[PDB]
RNA sequence: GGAGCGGUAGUUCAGUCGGUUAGAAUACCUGCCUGUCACGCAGGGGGUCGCGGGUUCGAGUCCCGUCCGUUCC
């Protein structure tokens, strides 16, 4: 009655061995006077074989797919192997077969993948609602398990680097502004509430103030905000905080850590070190701070090439970003790339065709006079199409940049592999909001760069933060910064952000407080584990790497949540559903 | 939010441009088949055509309300 091998791991080496298996019937092939059964468990498919003489035979007939069975048999080498199966050179001669549980037909199949066939794609709304059957699939189990291997290596590694795993609160204090959080009613006192943690941010520093050196926690975060992109009401992060670290210290650890995670779960070997790029460079070269380095169609400023030009647009433009695509684009395509540009904020998207000795199309008239120079900058050959976005340096680049991304599609760029890169040197503050003060780019506890320090007052702009993103394939998978451990500095930083003692207390009260008892220099980084897994996995959604995610509206089909409650169960909490 | 788009066997869908017995494929079921591995062959069952009302000699098809899914902004 006890299995003796995972059905899917039997091998030539087991030939001759009496065996007992337990699993799911993948498919049956009843040749009549012979019956073959593809027995399955998390480790693979073995083929069971039944002969009329054996007591297994009778049961082997009525058995059906997704039926749970316990099979006792004898591993024998197959006359003619199944080259697509790991256990394909062998099979079991059922001494017995017993139904542990019958099963009705699945709303969708769950077997091709176990044979190595391109699993089909049941509608997401079907997989969600039967998630337990969806997880019988091979890709899901494979992801769910890549996940395990991944996290387990994060422990393995950080533990080895003396990081203390500390589990942080789940029930906290709703914060005044910013990220809307999920609230938990306090029964014992209507109107009072707990808050589901946006992240361990504060407790991780406290733990640093606490004398622990380096903490790490595969945290769980919540945020009641549009699951717009592939968001989930609540996700998972790798949260890591360190003391007596300078940015370099934090990056080098994460690099090496990442390295480990990959070599350990994907058996990939990311070359090191990851490359770095100032926000200034990422923005320029790609018009984005999460560069997709899988291919290079870099932007180029050419703003200067037109200061003598009569083409009003290019000359009276703060910036003119130039991107040349290796392809004469259709009017259709060019029109599409244009909506991208406008969708990011851009008055429009000039273009022109590069033919020998000149340009034709779009804006070629004015490119002509600067031809030679413009060719050297964009490295464009004849047959290429030049695309231009002109306007504010940022609008210019984020737009030409978006375009650059669609263009990778349009062009066909088979974007493969993994490209990691640190985006360092972001500015401490940023700006646009008709409410004219300086907004803190990242977090208010984000430490300015020691150099730029005298700049806080005289030039809030050129002040770089000691923050950094970790991006993979144009995806922000990590954020983080060195933090302010000196109350006075934090104080000076609050001055720029037009922040008073009022909001200061009411938002960071206990923490600025703690800063008074000897906070060490610290800072760390958080990894949005979900997206990191989607990417290592190839899933287009983080849902493929979450045992039971929610649908786009954050509703849970499988379970029927959210849901209503008894009128009195809510009353016990002292609240009332008000609207009408 | 805006529109489109879709809803018809268990699944995927077709039902042509209003009158074809609402069918295919696949799935399921039964029969036969002793080396199959997508076994094969034969046959069988399975339809609230999203719901409501409307247009019409005739509605799965068109109108409208409304519900649900889904895609680009």
Swiss-Prot record:
Residues 201-204 are annotated as: Aspartate. It catalyses: tRNA(Asp) + L-aspartate + ATP = L-aspartyl-tRNA(Asp) + AMP + diphosphate. It is an enzyme of class 6 (ligase). PROSITE patterns: AA_TRNA_LIGASE_II. Its EC number is 6.1.1.12. ATP binds at residues 223-225, 232, 476, 528-531. One of its GO terms (molecular function) is ATP binding. GO terms for cellular component: cytoplasm. Gene3D superfamilies: Bira Bifunctional Protein, Domain 2, GAD-like domain, Nucleic acid-binding proteins. The keyword Phosphoprotein does not apply. Belongs to the class-II aminoacyl-tRNA synthetase family. Type 1 subfamily. This is Aspartate--tRNA(Asp) ligase.
């Amino acid at each position: 009655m006890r299995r003796t091998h995972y059905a899917g791991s039997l091998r030539e080496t087991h030939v001759g061995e009496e065996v007992v298996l337990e699993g799911w019937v993948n498919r049956r092939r009843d040749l009549g006077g012979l019956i073959f059964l593809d027995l399955r468990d998390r480790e693979g498919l073995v083929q069971l074989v039944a002969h009329p003489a054996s007591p297994a035979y009778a049961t082997a007939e009525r058995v059906r797919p997704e039926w749970v069975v316990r099979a006792k048999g004898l591993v024998r080498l197959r006359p003619e192997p199944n080259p697509r199966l790991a256990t394909g050179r062998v099979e079991v001669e059922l001494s017995a077969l017993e139904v542990l549980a019958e099963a009705k037909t699945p709303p969708f199949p769950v077997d091709a993948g176990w044979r190595g066939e391109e699993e089909k794609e049941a509608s997401e709304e079907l997989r969600l609602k039967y998630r337990y059957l969806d997880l019988r699939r091979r890709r899901m189990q494979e992801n769910l398990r890549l996940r395990h291997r991944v996290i387990k290596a994060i422990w393995d590694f950080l533990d080895r680097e003396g990081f203390v795993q500390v589990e942080t609160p789940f029930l906290t204090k709703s914060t005044p502004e910013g990220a809307r959080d999920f609230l938990v009613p306090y029964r014992h006192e209507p109107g009072l509430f707990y808050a589901l943690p946006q992240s361990p941010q504060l407790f991780k520093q406290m733990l640093m103030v606490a004398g622990l050196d380096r903490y790490f926690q595969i945290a769980r975060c919540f945020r009641d905000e549009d699951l717009r992109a592939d968001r989930q009401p609540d996700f998972t992060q790798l949260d890591l905080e360190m003391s007596f670290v300078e940015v370099e210290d934090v990056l080098e650890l994460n690099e090496r850590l990442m390295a480990h995670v990959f070599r350990e779960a994907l058996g990939v070997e990311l070359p090191l070190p990851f490359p770095r790029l100032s926000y200034e460079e990422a923005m320029e070269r790609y018009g984005s701070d999460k560069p997709d380095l899988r291919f290079g169609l870099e932007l180029k400023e050419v703003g200067p090439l037109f200061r003598q030009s009569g083409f009003r647009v290019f000359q009276e433009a703060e910036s003119v970003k130039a991107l040349a695509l290796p392809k004469a684009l259709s009017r259709k395509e060019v029109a599409e790339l244009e909506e991208v540009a406008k969708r990011h904020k851009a008055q429009g998207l000039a273009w022109a065709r590069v033919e020998e000795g000149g340009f034709s199309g779009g804006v070629a008239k004015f490119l002509e006079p600067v031809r030679e120079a413009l060719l050297q900058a964009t490295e464009a050959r004849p047959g290429d199409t030049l695309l231009f976005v002109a306007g504010p340096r940022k609008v210019a680049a984020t737009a030409l940049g978006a375009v650059r991304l669609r263009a990778a599609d349009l062009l066909g760029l088979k974007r493969e592999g993994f490209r990691f890169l640190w985006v360092v040197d972001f500015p401490l503050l940023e700006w646009d909001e008709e409410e004219e003060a300086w907004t803190y780019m990242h977090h208010p506890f984000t430490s300015p760069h020691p150099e730029d320090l005298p700049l806080l007052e005289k030039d809030p702009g050129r002040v770089r933060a000691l923050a950094y993103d970790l991006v993979l394939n144009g995806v922000e998978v990590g954020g983080g910064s060195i933090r302010i451990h000196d109350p006075r500095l934090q104080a000076r930083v609050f001055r720029l952000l037009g922040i008073g003692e009022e909001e200061q207390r009411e938002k960071f009260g206990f923490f600025l407080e703690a800063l008074e008892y000897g906070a060490p220099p610290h800072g760390g980084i958080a990894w949005g584990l979900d997206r990191l897994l989607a990417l290592m996995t190839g899933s287009p959604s983080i849902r493929e790497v979450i045992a039971f995610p929610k649908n786009k509206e954050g509703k849970d089909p499988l379970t029927g949540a959210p849901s209503p409650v008894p009128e009195e169960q809510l009353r016990e909490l002292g609240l009332m559903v008000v609207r009408p």
